[PDB]
Known about the structure:
16% of the residues lie in helices and 28% in strands. The chain is built from five helices and 14 strands. The strands form five sheets. Strands 1-14-13-12-4 form a five-stranded antiparallel beta sheet. A hairpin with a 5-residue loop joins strand 5 and strand 6. It starts with 9 loop residues before the first strand and ends in an 18-residue tail after the last strand. The site of one zinc ion has 2 residues, from loops. The site of one chloride ion has 3 residues, from loops. GO terms for molecular function: hydrolase activity; metal ion binding; nucleic acid binding.
Amino acid sequence: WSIEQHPNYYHVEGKAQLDIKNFPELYRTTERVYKKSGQSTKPVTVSNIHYSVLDGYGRSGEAYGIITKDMIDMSAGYREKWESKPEPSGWYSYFFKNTNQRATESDYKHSPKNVSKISNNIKASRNGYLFDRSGLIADSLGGRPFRNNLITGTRTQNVGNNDRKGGMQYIENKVLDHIKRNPKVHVYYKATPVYQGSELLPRAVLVSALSSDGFIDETVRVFNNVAGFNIDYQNGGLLSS
Ligand SMILES: [Cl-]
Ligand SMILES: [Cl-]
Ligand SMILES: [Zn+2]
Ligand SMILES: [Zn+2]
Ligand SMILES: [Zn+2]
Ligand SMILES: [Zn+2]
Ligand SMILES: [Zn+2]
Ligand SMILES: [Zn+2]
Ligand SMILES: [Zn+2]
Ligand SMILES: [Zn+2]
């Protein structure tokens, strides 16, 4: 990643390059049957977003769906609480008490007595946390609030410089806005975390978006970076000086 080349924490890589055939199908149902809340019999056109199961390291994988104005509308009004323990891979470090040697999340689930769990997150300068629970499929687009729809992202991966035009927010808002201005239009949307080796944090998220009216047709690479810090992609957190 280059702060010079890409100050907004993304790089436009090319066209959407999607296989629309592989996507979960659009269907017609009701707000009630879909959202599982309220008695809203309002008919809605939606798709069921495909989320990836975690891999063997506990890492989140790609998610993809067809985003509709109705999905946006239902997420605009309603919010779902975080499902229990949504923190994705690399969010914590684990260490064997006996050795002070690094352990894995698995080791911790296996024997919490002999393995400590410590947050990798830290506060940094206005003053807040450096890493976010960073959605793959945004809440505003119908995303589910659970681990599998998250990666451990830098605040800048998530929202860039937070001027509505950076990080995941860039491509999210562009899709959100275009559907909102063209309510009959739907967008094929896919967010794919890119990992190197067994690293628990993704280096980037690849987001591909193809609108049904052809207006939006791109893939952006959103960098899991933040200016002035060196992230430890292997274990999460920052490199130790
Ligand atoms: Cl595809
Ligand atoms: Cl830098
Ligand atoms: Zn670029
Ligand atoms: Zn599948
Ligand atoms: Zn929602
Ligand atoms: Zn839910
Ligand atoms: Zn986000
Ligand atoms: Zn547009
Ligand atoms: Zn279509
Ligand atoms: Zn040192």
